Amino acid sequence: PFITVGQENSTSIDLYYEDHGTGTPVVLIHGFPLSGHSWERQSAALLDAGARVITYDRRGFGQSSQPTTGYDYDTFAADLNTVLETLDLQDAVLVGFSMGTGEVARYVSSYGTARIAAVAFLASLEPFLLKTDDNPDGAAPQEFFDGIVAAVKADRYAFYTGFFNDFYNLDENLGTRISEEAVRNSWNTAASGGFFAAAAAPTTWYTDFRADIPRIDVPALILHGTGDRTLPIENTARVFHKALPSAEYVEVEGAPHGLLWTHAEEVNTALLAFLAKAQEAQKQKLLTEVETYVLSIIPSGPLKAEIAQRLEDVFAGKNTDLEVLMEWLKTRPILSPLTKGILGFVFTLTVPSERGLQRRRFVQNALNGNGDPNNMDKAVKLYRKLKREITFHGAKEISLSYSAGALASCMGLIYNRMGAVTTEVAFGLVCATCEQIADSQ
Amino acid sequence: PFITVGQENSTSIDLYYEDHGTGTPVVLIHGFPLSGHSWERQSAALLDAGARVITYDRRGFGQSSQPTTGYDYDTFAADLNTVLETLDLQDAVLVGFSMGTGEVARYVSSYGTARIAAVAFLASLEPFLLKTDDNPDGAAPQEFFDGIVAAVKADRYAFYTGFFNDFYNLDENLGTRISEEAVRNSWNTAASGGFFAAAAAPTTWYTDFRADIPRIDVPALILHGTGDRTLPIENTARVFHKALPSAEYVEVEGAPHGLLWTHAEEVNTALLAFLAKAQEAQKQKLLTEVETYVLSIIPSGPLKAEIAQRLEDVFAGKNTDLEVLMEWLKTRPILSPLTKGILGFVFTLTVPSERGLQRRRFVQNALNGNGDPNNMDKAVKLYRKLKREITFHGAKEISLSYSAGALASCMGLIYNRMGAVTTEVAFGLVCATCEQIADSQ
Amino acid sequence: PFITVGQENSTSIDLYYEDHGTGTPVVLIHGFPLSGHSWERQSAALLDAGARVITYDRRGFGQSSQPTTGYDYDTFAADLNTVLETLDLQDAVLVGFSMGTGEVARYVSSYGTARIAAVAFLASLEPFLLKTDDNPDGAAPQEFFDGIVAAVKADRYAFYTGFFNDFYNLDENLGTRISEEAVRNSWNTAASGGFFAAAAAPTTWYTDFRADIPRIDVPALILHGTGDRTLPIENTARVFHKALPSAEYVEVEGAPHGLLWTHAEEVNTALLAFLAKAQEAQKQKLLTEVETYVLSIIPSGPLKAEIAQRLEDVFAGKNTDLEVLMEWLKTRPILSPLTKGILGFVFTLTVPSERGLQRRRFVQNALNGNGDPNNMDKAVKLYRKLKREITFHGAKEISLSYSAGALASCMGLIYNRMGAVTTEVAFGLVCATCEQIADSQ
Amino acid sequence: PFITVGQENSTSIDLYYEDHGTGTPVVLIHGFPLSGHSWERQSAALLDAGARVITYDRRGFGQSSQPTTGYDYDTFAADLNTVLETLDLQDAVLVGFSMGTGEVARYVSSYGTARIAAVAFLASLEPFLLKTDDNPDGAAPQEFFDGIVAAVKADRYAFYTGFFNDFYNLDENLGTRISEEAVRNSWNTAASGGFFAAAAAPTTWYTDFRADIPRIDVPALILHGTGDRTLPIENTARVFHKALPSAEYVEVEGAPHGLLWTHAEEVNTALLAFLAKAQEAQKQKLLTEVETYVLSIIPSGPLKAEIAQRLEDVFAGKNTDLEVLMEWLKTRPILSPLTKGILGFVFTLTVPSERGLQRRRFVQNALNGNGDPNNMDKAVKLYRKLKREITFHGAKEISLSYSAGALASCMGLIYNRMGAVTTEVAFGLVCATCEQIADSQ
């Protein structure tokens, strides 16, 4: 798959990308001289943990186009922007490794954090690698970088060999943490990037990210290997955390630069916990959004208070005897049978422990729709469309083009297991039907 | 509630009707000069016994319109037709009392028995009250009826008094079988009917129903009070049973014309047993047809023997513990999940008492059409057509034009109470599905 | 007239209601086994006293539909809710008699007192008729109620006779307080209710209203006959007042259950004093409400003080010489001609005696809508709508959808006697106009 | 080139495919973890032998998309279906290797053999690799497969190395049958497949194909290497042939799993001979179909008998002196000149030895069409379309949209060498013209 980010002479500039899984979107930004595929150990874990995984190849690398233009962090950040806007990513996590950490800082800084829930920096460039008078903690002098450029231009192929040596601490990790075959794959990936991009990339490494850091708005994770030969932890991660004290901070003991493979475990575990925290917050936000829509249907009073409390408790994972919950709902006076069905539906969907409880007649009767075939026809049409949705908003939006009667019947289809849909899409459906009903009052 | 049956000058002609309970529809057609409310003792019993009770007021009576037109049995039968078609009554029982027995005969005769499961005649006019040369068993000469008309026109109010006397055998039954207050209510009801209808009604009483009787297609009950002063049992019920030997026949010893109140018991008991028996008999026949189709899907062996025995036992009306039945089915080895779903479905449909058992997950999963939207789309289309069917063969026939996947999903739709059809149509659906599956093997 | 409250099978459930008089709305809720018409002695008094009288027939009674469903106080209260919402009743008084007192408590309790100014309980069920361990003051054991049900099912017609005996204390009151004809009417009314409702009603009588009582928010009146044989004053009214000490409380010495007829006087006098207090307050509010809107258009200063004082004096009923008032207004400096017209209009409307004063040119010129035909067209359209309004708020609401120019012209139309509306509707019109004008400033 | 088979989140699922050569379509379905390019030794032979070669990359492999969904044989078979339908393949041969043999069985089984002339199974999975109680001949227990999955997830790169070892019997074949460079290419191909697909693939290997096998309708070839370490010939090919006795069956002595490369020769030779047989069978079928169309034109009688016999003899390759044949035809009484032309045309087309015989005047006169330019115009238009056809049916179908006159003229164009078309397309043309003529009679 490709996203077009610009034009070079007669040709467009296209970025290779992939889009896997369902749930909260997590965007992985690779390092030099590798591609989106270098995240494979992390992607698998994220997929299993229940996230939507987005990867892409930076211009000049992997399967992306290989222009001789736009090798700088503003362009790279603009490239990223195009991806985020193209996919309409909301509430996204940005994870950068090495070079990728430059994108994360520069994007956040320039474009802000409207689409962004959290950020993570792994084997970071930050805050400023160039050793100057005003930057004493800098890792190397300018002459040093000039050297790498010269080395890549001389023989990039041979260059990759010595680079992956220190990249992976092969003298320590070969035949242990990393196989010879895994290293072979990395060299092949690098050899496949553009000649021009290879030599141009190292000039972007001493970009000054010092003014980007105060812009970091959202929860952040900083993660570095203490055995990093490529980006000395002392000139990078350690001075970066001083600049961003608020960042959650993890040192990987004796981990090299290429810690994504050698220490995938330690990497995935830190990432997943941080992500789980962020995911929980996202779930809470969704619940509040779902809760507000659900409550909009209920007449104001003490009953509305009880229901809200129950919703909140189930959402917080505390309430859980569905059989007791459903009986309570069933026996509530004043509540409309339809509103009882909607709540019935919501509780069975959100409660963790459904156990072995059969579906409820009172809900079935409330949602089914009087048995009008025209109504049922439209509910089936909606269901067909919802089956293709993966987001709450997309689901909610298409649902709003249907009548309240067709919507309730559609909910019944799902409730009765006659059709099946993801929880977040089911939420969107429910909320559209609540909105329609509330709006009619 | 009203149903419009026609137009008189600037005004429409509306029939007052009521629609109570759930289950098999039973239509009660009142006598002169009373209304649908005169059935109150019978309605209560039928409601308790688990029937859907429909009553209406004949034109010119009770709360119906009071035109000066359409006082004849073809119009009265056409009126009834409009009611049946308006409500889309399927598999209905028609019960007539006195005048009402004229509707039953004439409707059946002219319009046929497509919607009609059984008929009942209480205190019947049949076969022909007019005493002629060709009708020797006739109850009275023409001059006698001419007399009643003249009497009603003279003072209908005073007339009702002497009429209810003989109607109820008040000289015997007052303060005993019937209260003075109950009689007062009857007079009030009569006084409330239209003046024109009161005088016009008695001209319809010597309608010749002799050619209607051979048309009676379906199981019938004939019931008469031996103390009937209004319709002599000897000129009516007794010669009627000769004309329809096949009719089930009940004499109420010393019961008057107004036996609905005075002998409600004896009335309700005969009615309820007949009501019960008809469904079972036809139900038994249907079960025996269905069993062969159902068994055709099961592999030969001892298990097939157990299932057949269970089918036969539920079909023969041994009320089985559905919960125990369903668990047994669920835990059967070798049986395909789909076959288990079909049997699961059949057992819940045929078992006398579901006892408020929640629907079963194993059946729902088996009959979900794989959650395929195309299957579900076709299942909904089939359902639309099945909604218009009233017979096992018609239902089975249209079902055979659909794929096994769409058929199973359709069964799921019904099982989940997302749609509804009559039991016999449901049988046709299950048998088409069984035929399709068996045929694939 | 009917209000639809639900659906039973193929038929809707409609409540018969009436809507008489003008002024503060008073809703009368009848007792068993009677109808809205049983309030006729009270309605006449309320109409003469200047109230808007709303009556309706409970489901299963009088001219309402006769379903075999919804015989319970939550449904009855929901029925009432539908009526109140359908008519958009504001600032309403709820008066219940016997069974009706159950509606009042349950509605107030569940739905709250937003539309409700005051409540009255006459011959109350409250707080809990069932005699139990936890309810010692209960009037009878469960077996006793079971008995009534059995009696009604046996012969409701005969039952009504003995019931009205004790209902009215006929052994005391016949030929004295109540005529034989009045009693005959009551029996006829009862005999006309639904058979099913008659037997189902007595099961609702031992509803526990104990948790409803603390919810009673608004001023209340409790009224009971000390000779009540149907609802013993000692198990009802007397323990009810303990539960609601705040309630105004009236014992009618030797009055039976059916005190609405036998003691209409004592009943109407207590009711009218309490209501009169409430009505006076409402009148004051209306004048005060009008006054605030009227004053909002006048610039702050000593003149605004004089005007306010004059308004208050005419509102308080000091009959003012309109001629003197109008001349004063006319000659006021600083006051806009339009504002003078509005005040001119208000004063002629509120002043007790116009004394045959010709309409004023200065007002006519001020309220002519600039003689613009488009304004006049819209003014006529508004007038058409206002002709159908009976309340201040309804009138004010529709008026706000019109421009200030059309509103002023409409006022002119009324001022010139070219059209006519009720005073309260006229008030709404003037206030909408004042609001529009003030809002423009 | 790509064919889209579905959608994953925001991205479509595209299969990489190639389409080479002309003639009968042969579809090659690769094995794990390789791509369509692994067939290169076979493709070259098929291309030289005169077949149309179609290859594609299974989802997750080679150049196809790499979703994290649809890794199962129903999806894989549905993928294949989309390819066949997209290309409108008629009379196709399906050849599967290893994993690919699962597609062949499942497609044939579910979708049937309408487009399919023959099938071939090389290094087959069939009939069921899982060793169970009911499957004793199974190659391994479930725990064994669970192991492979675990191994791939651990390090797929390293895994490929040991896999190709046994895949190729490198201990035997390296430096002999297979070069180190050829093996290097294979590893590169595998490393290029999707990470998720790599680990998911081995779960599809113990798919039960036992119910698919009886569905195999068309001529089949089973081919296995006796030195197969990956799929033991004893648990696969040998028990598979018992299940399909009818299959032509070839053991490659001491050939490994990767016999496509190591034993390309023995592989190509068996394949080509079978393909030739299949082609001959297809030709026989075509000859019989052609014969029926051709005979439909001839009046019944002894002449029709002679002609049929001659057709059959020429079709069976026995009759061959065209000059003698054509003279016989020419001199036949009763035969229409047009029918003589059609037969003349057919015989010159089917006879192997045309020798050096000039085209015949009697045929030319019969087919030319009277020289009407409109007729000729349409014949040229048809010819343009036929030039793009490669199948008998496609040819016959477009021909049927033309008049008999235009069709005969078109036949003349071809007969006169004014245009040129493939034999099978020429057959379709002839048969359309015969059908049209016969249909006119």
Side-chain angles (χ1 to χ4, degrees), chain D residues 169-278 281 286-374:
Chain D
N169 290 22
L170 291 180
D171 69 338
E172 298 164 14
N173 290 133
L174 196 60
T176 280
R177 301 221 158 242
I178 193 162
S179 70
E180 174 185 304
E181 290 92 344
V183 180
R184 188 154 71 238
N185 179 251
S186 289
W187 183 95
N188 283 162
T189 300
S192 97
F195 81 89
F196 186 93
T203 72
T204 75
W205 298 347
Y206 46 92
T207 290
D208 182 21
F209 296 106
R210 282 180 302 184
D212 295 316
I213 312 194
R215 305 276 161 264
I216 301 153
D217 225 320
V218 298
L221 168 77
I222 302 159
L223 192 147
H224 213 96
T226 73
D228 202 322
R229 293 173 196 166
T230 306
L231 305 176
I233 182 168
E234 41 269 318
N235 303 120
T236 59
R238 285 184 192 168
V239 13
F240 183 16
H241 191 219
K242 264 177 257 170
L244 198 63
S246 196
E248 170 156 326
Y249 182 90
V250 178
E251 290 200 355
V252 184
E253 217 55 62
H257 194 54
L259 78 192
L260 297 189
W261 191 269
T262 59
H263 295 73
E265 274 310 333
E266 297 86 339
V267 170
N268 294 351
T269 304
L271 193 48
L272 272 183
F274 175 75
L275 279 196
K277 304 193 224 191
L286 203 272
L287 294 190
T288 323
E289 176 155 39
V290 173
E291 187 183 356
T292 69
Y293 279 105
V294 169
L295 292 181
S296 71
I297 285 306
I298 304 164
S300 302
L303 193 33
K304 190 168 183 167
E306 283 139 33
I307 293 167
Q309 182 62 81
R310 281 156 207 283
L311 281 173
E312 292 160 344
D313 286 352
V314 174
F315 287 173
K318 183 47 66 165
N319 196 339
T320 192
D321 202 356
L322 184 60
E323 67 104 357
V324 166
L325 242 176
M326 293 300 268
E327 183 52 44
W328 180 80
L329 263 183
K330 182 180 171 144
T331 54
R332 290 313 82 186
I334 78 174
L335 280 189
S336 176
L338 197 233
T339 71
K340 284 179 177 185
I342 290 169
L343 287 159
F345 178 102
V346 167
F347 285 139
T348 88
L349 189 71
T350 56
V351 96
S353 325
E354 185 183 13
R355 303 157 188 217
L357 186 76
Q358 299 295 338
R359 293 297 155 94
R360 297 289 101 181
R361 177 80 197 267
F362 79 95
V363 178
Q364 296 164 350
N365 288 332
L367 300 177
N368 283 352
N370 92 346
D372 178 32
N374 285 295

Side-chain angles (χ1 to χ4, degrees), chain A residues 5 16 52 83 114 122 132 142 146 153 172 197 297 301 304 339-340 406 430 433-434:
Chain A
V5 294
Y16 178 82
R52 181 184 173 185
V83 174
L122 308 179
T132 76
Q142 170 76 55
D146 279 357
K153 284 179 167 158
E172 298 164 14
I297 285 306
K304 190 168 183 167
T339 71
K340 284 179 177 185
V430 155
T433 122
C434 286

Side-chain angles (χ1 to χ4, degrees), chain A residues 39-278:
Chain A
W39 291 101
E40 67 187 288
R41 284 208 157 151
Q42 286 68 48
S43 297
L46 294 179
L47 280 172
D48 288 340
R52 181 184 173 185
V53 185
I54 294 95
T55 61
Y56 76 98
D57 295 351
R58 179 178 301 100
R59 60 167 68 207
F61 297 90
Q63 297 175 265
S64 288
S65 292
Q66 302 176 357
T68 57
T69 36
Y71 293 103
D72 73 271
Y73 275 101
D74 292 317
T75 303
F76 294 156
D79 278 357
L80 171 56
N81 177 239
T82 288
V83 174
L84 293 186
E85 291 194 332
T86 298
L87 303 184
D88 196 13
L89 299 185
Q90 282 317 144
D91 216 47
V93 180
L94 304 181
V95 182
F97 165 76
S98 191
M99 254 191 100
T101 61
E103 267 96 353
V104 177
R106 185 56 50 83
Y107 171 90
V108 151
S109 169
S110 297
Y111 299 87
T113 55
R115 298 179 178 279
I116 311 296
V119 293
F121 301 91
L122 308 179
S124 316
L125 297 183
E126 278 81 13
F128 183 30
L129 277 178
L130 199 60
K131 195 151 187 291
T132 76
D133 315 286
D134 83 301
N135 189 68
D137 277 315
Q142 170 76 55
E143 299 88 78
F144 159 84
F145 294 97
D146 279 357
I148 298 157
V149 175
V152 182
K153 284 179 167 158
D155 190 345
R156 69 195 185 92
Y157 299 115
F159 164 89
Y160 299 138
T161 295
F163 183 85
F164 283 125
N165 232 288
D166 291 327
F167 182 100
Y168 292 123
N169 290 22
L170 291 180
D171 69 338
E172 298 164 14
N173 290 133
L174 196 60
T176 280
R177 301 222 158 242
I178 193 162
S179 70
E180 174 185 304
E181 290 92 344
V183 180
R184 188 154 71 238
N185 179 250
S186 289
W187 183 95
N188 283 162
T189 300
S192 97
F195 81 89
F196 186 93
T203 72
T204 75
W205 298 347
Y206 46 92
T207 290
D208 182 21
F209 296 106
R210 282 180 302 184
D212 295 316
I213 312 194
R215 305 276 160 262
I216 301 153
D217 225 320
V218 298
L221 168 77
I222 302 159
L223 192 147
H224 213 96
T226 73
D228 202 322
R229 293 173 196 166
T230 307
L231 305 176
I233 182 168
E234 41 269 318
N235 303 120
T236 59
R238 285 184 192 168
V239 13
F240 183 16
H241 192 219
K242 264 177 257 170
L244 198 63
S246 196
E248 170 156 326
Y249 182 91
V250 178
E251 290 200 354
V252 184
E253 272 157 41
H257 194 54
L259 78 192
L260 297 189
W261 191 269
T262 59
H263 295 73
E265 274 310 333
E266 297 87 339
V267 170
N268 294 351
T269 304
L271 193 47
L272 272 183
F274 177 76
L275 279 197
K277 307 190 221 191

